[PDB]
Design a protein around this ligand. Sequence first.
Ligand SMILES: CC[C@H](C)[C@@H]([C@@H](CC(=O)N1CCC[C@H]1[C@H](OC)[C@@H](C)C(=O)N[C@H](C)[C@@H](O)c1ccccc1)OC)N(C)C(=O)[C@@H](NC(=O)[C@@H](NC)C(C)C)C(C)C
Ligand SMILES: Nc1nc2c(ncn2[C@@H]2O[C@H](COP(=O)(O)OP(=O)(O)OP(=O)(O)O)[C@@H](O)[C@H]2O)c(=O)[nH]1
Ligand SMILES: Nc1nc2c(ncn2[C@@H]2O[C@H](COP(=O)(O)OP(=O)(O)O)[C@@H](O)[C@H]2O)c(=O)[nH]1
Ligand SMILES: [Ca+2]
Ligand SMILES: [Mg+2]
Ligand SMILES: [Mg+2]
Lengths: 430, 440
Amino acid sequence: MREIVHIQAGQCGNQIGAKFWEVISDEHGIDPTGSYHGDSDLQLERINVYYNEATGNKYVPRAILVDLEPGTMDSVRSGPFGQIFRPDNFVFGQSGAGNNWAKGHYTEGAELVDSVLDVVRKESESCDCLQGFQLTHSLGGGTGSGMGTLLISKIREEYPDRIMNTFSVMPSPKVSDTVVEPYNATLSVHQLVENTDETYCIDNEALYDICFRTLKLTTPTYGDLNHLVSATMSGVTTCLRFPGQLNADLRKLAVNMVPFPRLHFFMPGFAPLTSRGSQQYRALTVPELTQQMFDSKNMMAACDPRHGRYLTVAAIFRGRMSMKEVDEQMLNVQNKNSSYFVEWIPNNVKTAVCDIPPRGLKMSATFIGNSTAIQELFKRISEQFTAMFRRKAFLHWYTGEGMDEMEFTEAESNMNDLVSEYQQYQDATA
Amino acid sequence: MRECISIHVGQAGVQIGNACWELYCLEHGIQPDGQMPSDKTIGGGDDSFNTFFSETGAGKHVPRAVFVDLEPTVIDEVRTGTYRQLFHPEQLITGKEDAANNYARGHYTIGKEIIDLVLDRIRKLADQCTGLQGFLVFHSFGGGTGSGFTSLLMERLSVDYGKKSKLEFSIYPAPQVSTAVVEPYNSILTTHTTLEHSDCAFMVDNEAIYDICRRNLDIERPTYTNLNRLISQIVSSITASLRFDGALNVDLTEFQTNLVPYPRIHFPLATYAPVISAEKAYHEQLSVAEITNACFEPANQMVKCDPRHGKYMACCLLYRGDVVPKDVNAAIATIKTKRSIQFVDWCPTGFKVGINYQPPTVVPGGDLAKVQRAVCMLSNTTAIAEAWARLDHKFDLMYAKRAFVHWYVGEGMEEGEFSEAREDMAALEKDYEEVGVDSV
Ligand SMILES: CC[C@H](C)[C@@H]([C@@H](CC(=O)N1CCC[C@H]1[C@H](OC)[C@@H](C)C(=O)N[C@H](C)[C@@H](O)c1ccccc1)OC)N(C)C(=O)[C@@H](NC(=O)[C@@H](NC)C(C)C)C(C)C
Ligand SMILES: Nc1nc2c(ncn2[C@@H]2O[C@H](COP(=O)(O)OP(=O)(O)OP(=O)(O)O)[C@@H](O)[C@H]2O)c(=O)[nH]1
Ligand SMILES: Nc1nc2c(ncn2[C@@H]2O[C@H](COP(=O)(O)OP(=O)(O)O)[C@@H](O)[C@H]2O)c(=O)[nH]1
Ligand SMILES: [Ca+2]
Ligand SMILES: [Mg+2]
Ligand SMILES: [Mg+2]
């Protein structure tokens, strides 16, 4: 009974957050009404990590839904799994954040944040032994990015010894034409470097390219993008949710994955890559899972892992398979590409196997990499940031909310420092 | 929530308001007595059309609008016309003596006598709103009321509503339909006075509209009625994101974020397609690709200027009707190949796109064909400054001899206000030059 409290903020945050709860509710045999109807005891053994129990043996997600406008949450409450959420855990404003980090962090979000913290507190108080928090949000908008990071900082102040974990969706001009997203994202990364323990870098650039190139979807939708995100979120939380040895709680994961406190940005990967309703009939072999899960084309961050080195890796295999073959194949990846794993962290790849496959697959594998190649992502954002900032373009939207240019300069400098620190360990020898 | 209050000032503002509100009624299925059978919530609601229409207990849908003019004869036609039941009498405000094409009379001598009453009536509208978003202000550059009273009103609105957003639709003068020699003076005076009070201003060049009516609709000698029906389609395109919702709809405020990189650089160029007669549209399917391509033809612009001789800082496409994502994406791809659209080096080049599924509407007796799909492009281009340069030149010719200046001085203005206004315009032209220069 090591509870996690889940928060989802802004449009993107609530969209992928709601999909996460649909996907893992089905895995745990919980229906849209909160009733359990599964066939395995494995489903319920750690159900309390993400669910509260009610009377009638109802299971309620330990989830808080936040937004500065009502639209997406109205959508969620009218979705399939809308009823499953605790009605008092819907916390929303009317003003919106207008894709503006300053509105989310300093003005509009500040008016709403105490209400949110009140709900967070009610959930935390109910916990036998709270582990920490997970937040879903995008970095490119205003609410998830600005108010999301505001929340992270306030939660850290009230719960300074708990783990803070985020699923953070990075903007890409391949998916959004909103010009200020690199500003919002850079301001947010500055916050994440300081205040989270673990951040999964979910890159819309990678998501779009997987859909277009690999899944051959000529007009990718957010539904298609979020299908990849919810598969990934299911895979990377598997060790938290089912009986197991490795990375079985947020703190043990962090101690295995984070060798230096600022370098806590992870590149997730998944195999097999599927589109919604592709419904494929051949299971992958263990060698296939292993090859594909490490492939650049299967990464959810648009970074070439061959351009960097792995500091640490977690791999999670799901389904009925030979654990002997899993061990053999995992050893083969490392022994065949040993130069890509830093030699000064011995045995830095850990493997978990869970018997329960995700819905629709017999076999799957999820990859979590702490790779120095993630610098490519931050460099991409930094270049977009500087192209505008050198001319102070669009800054009036932010200074109108009380921000000074100095705050932008500090955020930029901190992210460029982060990039340089990755490069440092990339070039480091034993 | 998210209410928008429209303010129609002077003859041009009022007559364009007539055309816009008639068109909105047809778009939403509101009858001229204000009833809307399709609306099942009586006496209120938070539907998308409610941003522009309030409701009475008796089922009336009432424009969130004030009409104001310094003489009565234009608003009197509203009071006795087809849509007279649509407006509460207190929404229609008139004085007795107009500004006589003199900014100074509109802003000072005559305008000062009615400004408090106008603000009182705007306040009554504002009080009805649960989340007022801002104002939309319609006026000519050239008229004494459209120039001088609008400036006075905008200044007073900044004081009374702070930084609540104010957008303009501003009618830029053309010699084919102009009525005063001093329109360049009035234009420069009001642009200077209103510049720090407006968040976004859509200029409508009467010569561009006049040309489009002649060339595309084969109208021999366009009237204000011809011009205003076209203008209202363009205005409707721009406000559609506020009045309708759909999964692919993108709010006007989101376009505005992209369109305004610095507070003073807030004058988008609008381009609208298709503008075609019934005769020519018959048996002719104008595809998404075709109407999108037409956005980059200067012939279809609302302001005469040449964006091919300038640089872009933003490009937004506002679609309505039978328009699906795959076709828009393919059309933009094609355009980016074939047209050289040059952006400044400090802006991204991706076009921001909104789609509203409700198709365009036409008013009975018009010259526009009813079409399945239409688009309005809003671009931020350095070329818009051409329009300032033309007006500034006309101002300079007259001001050098102080021609007509005594009409303004006699109403209490000083020559210093003229030179201050012209210097602000010189600085604006220089601002548009500077944003076009490459970064170091
Ligand atoms: C590549 C950028 C996104 C992904 C696509 C997508 C948006 C979408 O999926 N949208 C707009 C909310 C509705 C949603 C989809 O309908 C189309 C529904 C079916 C959905 O996927 N709904 C999912 C299941 C739902 O959970 C959901 C998720 C997020 C938001 C709302 C609802 O439509 C193709 N967009 C904007 C586009 O393709 C647009 N094109 C562009 O923006 C191009 N630039 C002009 C580039 C960036 C691709 C066209 C519409 C002009
Ligand atoms: N497009 C359009 N332009 C108009 C219309 N009415 C007047 N204009 C233009 O507006 C300018 C004249 O200003 P008006 O709006 O008539 O003047 P006013 O605001 O009523 O001011 P005064 O009469 O001086 O008090 C000229 O450029 C006219 O061409 C109209 O209905 N449609
Ligand atoms: N992958 C994904 N990205 C999204 C979704 N919704 C919005 N985004 C992205 O999130 C960013 C905009 O932030 P958004 O969450 O809409 O703004 P907020 O409501 O102010 O937090 C852009 O980069 C969008 O492309 C979604 O459902 N899935
Ligand atoms: Ca109603
Ligand atoms: Mg959004
Ligand atoms: Mg008049």
